[model samples]
Every structure is written in structure tokens, then in C-alpha cells.
Target: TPVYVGGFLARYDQSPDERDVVEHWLHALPLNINHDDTAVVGHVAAMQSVRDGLFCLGCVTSPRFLEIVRRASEKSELVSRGPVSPLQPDKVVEFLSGSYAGLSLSTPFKHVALCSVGRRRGTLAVYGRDPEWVTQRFPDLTAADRDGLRAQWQSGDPFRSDSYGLLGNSVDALYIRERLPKLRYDKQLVGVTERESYVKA
Candidate 1:
């Protein structure tokens, strides 16, 4: 008998309904949602939180919203289409953390077919996969923190720096500033200033 001890790999395929939703949403939008469109960016941010189960913060969103954003994202160049073959978690994580550190890598953004929506930019905001996780990784996003990340970004400061270099290049500050105020808000969503603020305490 041969002993096997290395790694395992598997790919989770989106269900038929999920595929249909993705396809339909893709077909519905115009071919240029712009990476930084507030609607686009907000949706991506909201989805990222939800995908990781981080909605326990003030940032509320839903699957319906996910679809809305998904359509928009699909229209833009930011959408991710991972490798054609299935891979293990290690490979996936390695790829994300390795050479492709930035550049809007798509794996995290790709799993939006079944996320649930809670609140949308309001008082009872929850971020990260959970409250603890949010603080651990996004301490500044908490209500008690007093840093105006949004204002900083608006004042011409970059939101974040990574392998992708400076953030918001794909975004429109004017549009983001204009649209953010109009979005529904409660305690959770409206309180946030910057996405980076969400990461720092």
C-alpha cells in the first residue's frame, strides 16, 4: 500500500440558479460600470463584508444588493474569473497573498451568488465577517473610533496603498462624494469614513 500525504483540492461550482443569476446580471448591464463608481465601489465593499460574514458591523447589504453590484461589477474590468481548474485552499490563498498581492485580484469578489443582505449604510452597521473580526482587522471602522477617513479621501489623500499602488484610481471622487450622502444610512453604514479606516483601529 502507498501512503499519500500532501494536499487535497476541490472547486465549489455555483449552483444552476447562481449561474443563471450571474449570467442574467451580466447581460443586463452596460459594458462600463467604472471600477470606482460609488455604486460599484459601495457594492463591492458591501459584498466583501458579506462574503466574509462581516456584516455584523454597521455596513448593511443584501443578496439582492449583491446582484445589483454584481451586474455593475461584471460590466467593469474589476470582476475576477479565477483559473479554469479547481484548486485547494492553500493554492488559492498562496495566489492571493503572493505575487498577485494587489491588482484587484478577483477570487474574493467572485463568490457572491448566495450572500445574504442585512442593512445598507445605516445606524446598526456591522463590518467584517463578525464584530471581533472587524476590530481585529478593521479597528478604525468601529463607531467609537474618531478618524475621518472619508473626509481624508475627499481631501485628496489616498485611501490605501498596496501592490495595486494607490487606491481609488478606478474611482471617481466627485461621484463617490455625491452618491454617498444619498445612499440609505443608519448607524452602521453612514458612520464609516474610509475603507482603510475599516482596517485600522
Candidate 2:
């Protein structure tokens, strides 16, 4: 018997409906990312969170929102395409842990695409096909945690240096700043922040 043991790999089992949703969303928006636009940045932050293996956090976004962001990604030149996006997760992590982590990379943005909504709200449509496996790697994570992380990215906060040289930022002030409606939309869509305030405490 041949053994194929190695690094991390993601397997998707999207339903036909989900596939249609993904395709339709792609067609609806041809990709558009703009740095100067806060909404664009917010969506980009969300997209990056999904790509980086960090789940989506906060008030659930509609599939419409994802489609809108997809267009933004196509426009901005930061969104991933095809298998290339999934294949490069390891490399992406490397780069993020390098000099480019402080900003969205020229090629890929780290994200984890937990779920995308369509024409509805308040109803749950769990997104991940492999939540259990993900949880194993990143315990102490919850849907709300994902929401909060993404929300932080939406707040226009600049990326800071991580110990591993990856782009990151603390999520204390950011969480408060982005909780308002409309005015508080910019946020972080990925990564973990300390649960307890070490600095304040």
C-alpha cells in the first residue's frame, strides 16, 4: 500500500445549489477591488479572511455581498482564481509570515470562506464542508469569533507585524469602532485576537 501523508489540503463538497450560487455570483460580478473605497476594503478584508483559513465572523453576509465582493476582487487584482488559490495556501502562509503579511499580498489573500448567503437573513446555512477538521487545527474558535475577526478588517486598520512576520493586528479597539450600523462596517474578516485584554488587564 502506498501512503500519501503530507501537509494541509482542503476538500470541498458544495451542493449543486451551492455551486450554482457560486457560479452565479461569479458571473454577477467580474471582480473589482479598490483600496481607496472603504466598502471595497471591507469586502476585501472579508475575502482575505476566507482565503487565509480564518472563518468569516460577524453579522452574516449575504451571497449577494460575496458576489459584490467577487466583482470587487476581480477588479482589484487581489482575489484568487481556480485551483491556484487552494494550492498556494502553504505558500501564502509563508509569504504572510514574511514581509508582505502586513498588507494584502500581490498574488493571494489569506481567507477561509465559511459561508455565503443569498436573498435571506436570520436563517442558518452552514458553509464549511469540513468544519470538524478545521476546528481540530484551530480550537477555541466560534462563528462569532470569525465574525468579529472579519469585522476588525472592515475598520480600515493598518496591518501590523506578527511574530511569524505575517500581517496582523490586535482586535480590541477595532471591535468597538466597527459595531455601529453603516458607519461601522470596515472590519477584520480573519485571524484570532486575544480573548482577554492583556494590555488593559
Candidate 3:
């Protein structure tokens, strides 16, 4: 319903501090807005830039944004499936700088963190936007580098759920089952059993 997103927009307009606009909206995500609500979901995704005061960096529905998100999601998934090295700090810096080359922010490194998450078999060390800064910021990223994993090993694992729980039972998991066999560990030989609200990339 329009009232769902409309109420969010009204609250957003009245708030003086837009820093946590999206977080605030998320806490109060109206009952009408399901995880699959594309219109409202897209709005929240696009509003990140507005909250960061970095408007017009890129359109959320643009091909470029979708492609970027696709790469980031796949890279993160790969890391989660098996033991893998993380990205170097310098490389992380390089990626952050290169990914947002045109944003032209004064403080380019303010809202991003480099960390790893996933199952015990494999870990993906990734440079992710802080979600707090409120912009598309640096697109979440990862790389294969042995030295970087040694450097940033203190953060620990972030996700413990399996692909079934993470991806749900949609065609995506079937696609994942066929394409990414690494996710099939000794522990999860039979694969995921529960249905969840998974975000499609």
C-alpha cells in the first residue's frame, strides 16, 4: 500500500538528522511492506545516497548499480562456501577508491569496513559499506589475497546459516546447487531445509 512507504517518506522529511533515516525506517518497516516489496525495497536502496548527502551518484535501478550488486553478492557467496583469503588493506583502499571514483566525497573512507563472514568451511573477507553512513558508498567487495587474511583475522565469522536458509528454496538455490558445489559441505550434505525471506540480488 502507498501508505506504507508514504508514512516512511513523511517521517524522513520531518527528521532533522537524516543520518539514520534508513535504519529508522527499517526499525519501523510498515506491515504492508514485505521483504519482496520491490517498490519500497528499491526506495530504501536509493535513499541511502540521499541520507549520505551524496545525491545522484547513481540511480538504484541503473544497469551499473545492478551489475555491481551482482558481483558483490556472488563474491560474498563464494567466500562463504569455503576457506578463502581476504583482500589486502591497500587493495581494499584501491577498491574503495576505484569503486566510488566519481562520488567525490571529502571523507572517502569514513563508512566502510573490511571483514569476513559465512560458514566454517570457507570464509570470504569483504570490504562492505557500514550501512550506517547511508549511501551506496563503496559497493561491498572482496578479493583473493593470502596476506590480507592474515592481517584481518580478528573480526571473526559473521554468518553461520546455510545457503538454504540464506537463499531460500527458490530457483536461486537450485541455481546455486548446480553452479556452486563448494557450498555442499560434509555437514550440509543434504542441504538447507527451511524457507526464509531471502533478498534477491
Candidate 4:
């Protein structure tokens, strides 16, 4: 879990509204527009405490989730917490590289989105590489291994439920067991959830 996003959700009981929150970051930051939703979550977590709201960009698609979203929206300014947006990567890098005080990152961003969280006096973010890409890249994997992995990591089509897997493992996830000693942030990853799996700088 991205601790910061959990922090935002639990602390504020809210995430950023896409109308301005996500839009501002989309332009304010950069984008490859090519990854999955993890990047979007990393971006949302990166904004730290300076944000007006958290632009949680998922738990996505379930009716109950949307029902909660609607209830939350009606009472306060909010983000509807949908899934896999195109502009996810930018916010994570932007926030880490920005001149902020508290830098936070969530996993897979710790690996894939890492340009460095060094720009801030203190910083952090979480990351793991794209699992589908890893599965695609494995040259010698068995057909069963490969196909099983594809099913586990597939994210492109939400309409198909069998294709989407819970994020329990990844290429970057193999490390971080994952952290830092100085510059003020460091470890905590066993990917998915291992009581560790966190990064801050």
C-alpha cells in the first residue's frame, strides 16, 4: 500500500478532485502517458500535504466504490477515484523533484518513476516496474509461467475481469525486502503488502 495515499484517505477521508487537482498536475508536470494506474497513485501520493485534495486517480469500477465516491463528492470537494489514467507518471516525478519539504513515494514508483527524490530537502515515493512489461520481457520463461503472468499483470482492458490481477508481485518487487540511510529517507518494500513496502526522502 502507498502509505501516503492511505494517509490522505484516512486523514482527510478524501482524495483530490480530478477537475483541478489532477488537471493542474497533468500540465504542471510531464507525462509519457504510457503506464498503468500505479503511476497515477504515485503522482497523487507525491503531492504531500500541500495539495488542496488528493487526486487519487482506484479500487475502481465497482458500484459500491462509486456509491461511496458520490456520497463523498456531495459532502465535500473530491476525486472520484477511478482507474488507469494516462498522465500518472508526471506527478510522482514532479513532486519528488519539486522544492518541497516532505517527499513521499509509493511503490512501483520507487522503481519505474524514479528519476530521484533528491530535489527536495527530504523526499520519498513508492515504486515497482510495470509487471506486464516484465512478463513480456522475460525471454526464457515457460509458456505456462508466461501466460500465467500475463493474466496476473494485464491492465489494459477493465471490461474483462479475468485479465486484471491483484498487485501482489512484480519485477521491481523482487527487491526492497526494499529503503535508504541518508538524505533523510529510506526501505520497506516486500511489494504488494508485507508490513514494509514504503519509501520516503
Candidate 5:
């Protein structure tokens, strides 16, 4: 008999509504990642950027704000078709596709997406999955006994090489950049800093 594996590979259960959200936008923008995880580099960093008070499009994106970003992702045909000016102009989405790690390849910007936003000056931010998973693989991401995790992100080992090199199933965000968005912070959206300092980076 064949060995019985657990149900982890089933791809979980998701609604068509959720799929269309990604689908509508897939064609709605200039770029679209084949799968989701391959965009890991920008993917993870975008997640961290959210904590920095930036509105990122990812699996973790706040549903309310997600509503805002999706307009461009799903119905840009009514507007323009490229990444240059996807949003309403009133909104500011600092992080774009390939940037953050959502359930789907760090969400739109996913890996390549986040890299684009950060590539402006080569500043960006990683993760295997959860916060715990990150520091677990690279001790550099953790605090020094009493020091802490920001140091991990501020100077973690993941970005040392890049999101493209295939480091631990990760890709180098260096693969692409200068791609998308008009994301600045609005009090109605997420909260954060350097007035786009780390986020702006």
C-alpha cells in the first residue's frame, strides 16, 4: 500500500470570490506572478512594511484597504492598463505586487512586487512563513538574548544575498523593481513612519 500523507497539499479551501479578486487583478495590472511563493523575496518584506505603517497588498492586507487596492487589480481596463497609474491617485499604495507574503505569493506584489517598491533606493525588507519561522532559520533575525527582532529585520541575513539566489526556497527581490504604486499613508488606512522611511525605502 502507498504511504498515506497528511492533507496538507490539498491547497486548502477558498471561495471563487477570493480567486476572482486575484484573477481580476492578475489581468488588471502590468505584471502577474505565475504562482505565489516564487515571489517570496518581495513577498515577506512587504509584510514587514505593513507593520511599519504602510498599506501593502498581500494576504495580510486589511480587508477594508484591500477593497481599495483591488479596484486597480480587478478593473483597471476602465482606467489605464499599466502599473504607472493604477490607483485612483487619491490612494497611496507604497508596496506593490511581489512585495508582501500573503497566502498567495506574498500577495499581488508578492516577491517581485515588493522588490519593485523598495528598489527605488534598494531598501526593503523576509520570512519563511510566520514571525517565529523567520528567526528560527536565521538567528541574525532575532534579538541577542535581551536585544530583539527589529534588529533581525533591520539587519537580517535574508537580504544579505538577495531574493533571487534561491536561498532557502527564497528569491532575490533584486530580480525587479521601479514597477508600481502611489501608496502614501492616510490616517484612514494603516499607520506608520520616516514618513515612508523604511516603508519608502
Candidate 6:
């Protein structure tokens, strides 16, 4: 599963003051962070621009995830599965921007770290405007509707035991329903996860 540090169990004793501020800022956003004894899951709708650097909009599921991201960054010898590389930031951007063939569609997967609680389902990482481009490319998607779609995405899902359970199943459809108007109203909301926080890019 994606990182789950939303429960407020991370070791805060050693965090620097700036890091604490960053963490609070993250909590203020739509993503969820959870900790389970040995792991930390830092999830976010958009990338986290910390004092140190730009963190992916997703979570750090465990030390394993950190290790891979760090390794891919520190050593170009290791090819990472997804975008983001320390040695080749351009490659990550290019990959996310759909410049790389056979990988990402022209959606906004590069800038956002969207997730579902249990499964990786209908998730879509949005970038630039033009909902038409996304709809045409992903036929199963829809713009977010201010009326009800937003509610559907944000409220707690009854079936799953977590706050982020149902997003994967309906994100594409929800985006088509709620994203256009919501985003048009505020474009700074670069990172949107239907139910949760829509971060200012």
C-alpha cells in the first residue's frame, strides 16, 4: 500500500523546527500521512517543496521506498520504476510531461501524488488545464462537479476502514465531474484528490 502516516505516529522528537512546520503544512493539505511502528506513509495531493528539496506528491511507504528513491537519485546505475531521479530531474519531468514514449499519458502524473486507500485504481495525476485533453485520452474519466462529486470523493468511505479508501475506484470519473469547475475557480489547486486537500501549486 502507499505510505500511511495520517494517524500521527511518526517520531517527532528528532524533527527540526522547520521540518515540524513542513509537517504541519502537509497535514493542512489533502494528503494523508500515517505511521505503523516501523514505517511512515507520507501522502500528498501535490509535490511537497520542503526547505531541502521537492518531495514527490506521493508517500514514503517505508524505508524501502526511501531507499529506492534515494538510490535512483544517488546512482543513475539503478533504473527506477516510476518518475523522479536525483541525477536526472529532467528525465522525471519529461516522463511526467508525456515526453517519454510508452509510459505516462499526457495527464498530470508528474506533479501530483494521488492515491487510493487499498488499491491503485482509477488514479490520475493532473497537470495543466484543458480537461478536454484528459477526457479524450482517458475515456473513463470526468471533470470534478462542484455539486456532488467533490462530496463523494472527500467524505469517508463506509466500506473501507481508512479515510482514503475509495478514491482509486472513482477518481477518473470524479475528476471529470468535479475538477473542471473547482479548478477553474482556483487554478492554484494544482494537486487535487477529490475528497481531500487541493494544494496550491
lDDT of each: 0.23, 0.23, 0.22, 0.25, 0.25, 0.26
Candidate 3's TM-score:
0.17
TM-score of each: 0.22, 0.21, 0.17, 0.20, 0.21, 0.22
lDDT of 6 by residue, 14-129 (tens): 23343454445443123321112122223332323222222222222334433433443444322233333232333222222221011110122212222211111112343222
RMSD of each: 19.7, 17.8, 19.5, 20.0, 18.4, 18.2
Q: What is the per-residue lDDT of model 4 for residues 1-201, given as tens digits with 9 covering 90 to 100?
A: 111211111112223242243335332121110133333222321222222222111112233322332343344311222112242332322222221112222322321122232222222323223333322322223355545334422323222111122122222333433123422322121111222222223
Off by over 4 Å in 1: 1-56, 79-127, 139-201
Q: Which residues of candidate 2, in runs, are more than 4 Å off?
A: 1-61, 80-130, 139-201
lDDT per residue as tens, model 3, 1-201:
100010011112222332454335422111111122221112212222232122211112223323333454445533334222342232222232222211111112211111111122221111232322211111221122212222322112222333333234234324433323332221132111111101011
Please report the TM-score between candidate 2 and the true structure: 0.21
Q: 102-162 in candidate 1: lDDT tens per residue?
A: 1111222332111111112221222223333333333224332212222221112112222
Q: Which ten residues in a row have the lowest lDDT in candidate 3?
A: 1-10
Q: What lDDT is reached at residue 29 by model 4?
A: 20
Candidate 2 at 148: error in angstroms? 19
Misplaced by over 4 Å in model 3 are 1-7, 12-59, 77-201
TM-score of 1: 0.22
Evaluation by TM-score, superior candidate among 1 and 2: 1
